Symmetry: C3
Subunit: 295 residues, 3 copies
């Protein structure tokens, strides 16, 4: 009887799909989380120089978005005065071509009606600004902090589902591996960049962005012991760089050390969805099923 | 037949409203995004002083919330010792009125049972703290970094819808305009403050907060080429200021340069809603429609 | 009549539960918020030292996650050179046990094939790094900034519901109390730590994390004057610490002041749910009710 067949197909639709498969009896809720990150590693740059956590992590106190320096270019002992600007901003020969005002595309200062020597043969437009000017860009290759590949990331996380009042936490040697140590919160940087689909050598010489996700997909009808985190690594490359300066005083004069920092930016996002049996969606689904069953 | 009329009105309700208008056949999902911001600009303050990106952007590495300084008040060469406090904290004449302990409403240090001169005629309570004390507030008018009006904001954004596994990115001269260049990720600061409904002159002399929103309202039944971002500027004024210090050492003594920074705070929020046809909501809606159709 | 009874029980289910209790006629929406925080307080540490807001708040400009220092350990005048490492890293007696390379678990530098004296009796492995090495950990007890208990937190908040286009803001003496001053945005630190279920003395000597939540549960069918914020304090302890350095130049040599900062981390999360009567959920619920009523 075709009526019996259509009744059966509608019935199997509701029970087999809405409830068994899509869990129509459940209601989704969000979570609130806190993430803490600790960096373990040392680097040597060549006199010889050593970089500690207080030096290669931005910001110091930590944040969901933080940068780990992998390479840099330093312009030291930079004061404020009159100096020749970069020749890429324009090579001049006579004072007629030096119009006072503002530069563009890399403006290092305010120009002036004067031409001064740059490298004993070319004459560039004189500027007022932070002098001496930032040296022509020559990114070190290989990167200066190439040892960053072996630093470690200890990630602490504590979530809470406000709707169901459920809290969980993600916690003498261990390193994370996808199918060997799946529940080790300590990650090596080279592993994360490889898992994001990125070459750490290139991502160290220019910089890059690596996203980190902690998926707390939990079925609360089960135990809380089975509500575990799942880590996934995302490649969000054109590079990542920023400029920061260390200001100091010598002989009463204020100087600065300009750094152009190439580093890997890590973004940690915690998103999860939990469900629990409710009576409203069950009745809603069965009523819709009865309606379609009849029609 | 009134029964036919009510059948028609119920039917037009479901098809015409739930499905055609509110898209009852779709299911909403969230997104995960990463934002990167670059600042292009130079400023001159008067000896003459020049402010670079490493100097007027807080924090250096960048963040979804960042501040661009537009004005400041600097108390230089500030050491730790015994000095007269601000007369606004209380003008004294005799040691009897100087009770050692703690001040209030602007406490510059711990008091002591002594009165010392402040400006050769008034005698204020002696304190231990960072001396000399912060000079009386006189906000510069017009602002010192009044050239901030013409700086530019290059915004990078990359979103991803976890449910439908859809990723999108928002990307020789271009500046954003609302109905001229609607898809240019480079914004001039004075434009954003005007669009937020704010005067940049006042918002530069005191500070302020400007919110930036990137609405990725995308209908995934269409192409991904039509899933574009939409920028909206919000005015979230009492002002925005904060204090930060540059610490240095001279002759073995630690000093600091206290800055009171007035600047514009930019908050970037990425929120969007995407939909895709599903079978659960369609059946739910039609079942409810059959129920109401009959009753 | 049992049929009348089942009709009555189904009917009371829908009207009494979906609509009256769970507000099935409403539709939930999220919000976008901005938070600003101001710290009022002074501390004295013993020559005598005074800590201002520019010194004990990380970051300076402010952020939803910020740290207020409560205790610290400072290693001053730290240069780069050859020095004996910490004896906890290994006590040696002969050069045979000094293998050049890298240390572990606390690596202070790169070792070398040499043994040098540490405290005139033990000989430790010589390293290159930031010298002199960080002194053995002795956390001050009681904490150095023990006056942090009486600092204040002024919280500004401005929310907006994008769906219903509703904006709200949470705003000569006032301090917050749970059942005395419920709408005072100024919180004392010792109150927040007590409300989180934490001892401020211990949380000051090691550090800790305190979460702050602003629940904007608003029923938009009422007035907006009744859409008020609700503050809740969460205890998210193993402690919280980080390392940061102040770099300075003396006699042409770069030194640094390494700080190990123990402080309380405050996380502010703004989440709320607003509802407004809609026609889609009402019809959906009544259709499901008619379906179940019949079956
Ligand atoms: C001087 O700088 C100019 C910049 O265009 C460059 O072409 C030239 O080769 C430089 N000279 C030397 C000797 O480096
Ligand atoms: C990382 O460690 C491996 C040994 O496990 C070593 O071969 C490699 O050179 C190290 N990389 C760096 C750059 O420190
Ligand atoms: C990519 O990584 C491989 C090692 O996995 C290396 O051999 C290769 O040189 C890298 N490519 C670039 C462009 O650096
Ligand atoms: C000295 O300071 C007091 C502060 O109340 C002020 O009234 C007075 O005018 C000042 N004197 C001078 C000469 O500035
Ligand atoms: C911004 O540029 C315009 C010209 O486009 C100029 O008139 C104005 O003075 C500039 N503003 C500042 C303060 O730099
Ligand atoms: C507001 O902006 C206008 C220019 O658009 C300017 O003329 C006016 O002085 C500004 N108002 C204040 C109070 O600065
Ligand atoms: C020297 O350091 C070692 C480290 O193990 C310690 O055992 C010893 O007591 C110290 N000596 C003195 C005099 O502090
Ligand atoms: C906080 O204030 C109370 C008085 O209200 C005082 O007893 C207490 O010692 C203060 N705590 C600190 C450490 O400043
Ligand atoms: C906890 O706080 C109480 C005061 O409320 C104090 O007496 C006690 O010593 C504290 N406990 C610790 C371990 O510091």
């Amino acid at each position: 009887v075709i009526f019996r067949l259509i009744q059966l197909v509608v019935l199997v639709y509701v029970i087999g799909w809405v409830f068994l498969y899509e869990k129509g009896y459940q209601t989704s809720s969000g979570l609130i989380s806190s993430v803490s990150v600790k960096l373990k590693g040392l680097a040597v740059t060549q006199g010889p120089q050593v970089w500690d956590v207080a030096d290669y992590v931005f910001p110091a106190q930590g944040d969901n978005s933080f940068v780990v320096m992998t390479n840099f270019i330093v312009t030291p002992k930079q004061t404020q005065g009159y100096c020749a600007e970069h020749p890429e901003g324009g090579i001049c020969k006579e004072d007629s071509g030096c119009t006072p005002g503002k530069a563009k595309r890399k403006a290092q200062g305010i120009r002036t009606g004067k031409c001064v020597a740059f490298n004993d043969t070319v004459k560039t437009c004189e500027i007022f600004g932070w002098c001496p000017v930032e040296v022509d860009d020559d990114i070190p290759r290989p990167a200066l902090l190439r040892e960053a590949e072996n630093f470690t990331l200890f990630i602490k996380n504590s979530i809470s589902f406000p709707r169901f009042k459920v809290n969980r936490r993600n916690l003498k040697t261990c390193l994370f591996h996808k199918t060997l140590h799946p529940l080790c919160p300590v990650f090596q940087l080279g592993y994360v960049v490889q898992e994001s689909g990125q070459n750490f050598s290139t991502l160290a010489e220019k910089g890059g962005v690596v996203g980190i996700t902690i998926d707390w997909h939990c079925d609360l009808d089960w135990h809380v012991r089975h509500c575990r985190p799942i880590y996934e690594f995302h490649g969000l490359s054109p590079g990542f760089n920023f400029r920061f300066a260390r200001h100091f005083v010598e002989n009463g004069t204020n100087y600065r050390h300009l750094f152009k920092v190439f580093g890997i930016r890590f973004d940690i996002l915690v998103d999860g969805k939990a469900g629990k049996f409710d009576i409203i969606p069950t009745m809603t689904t069965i009523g819709s099923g009865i309606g379609i069953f009849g029609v």
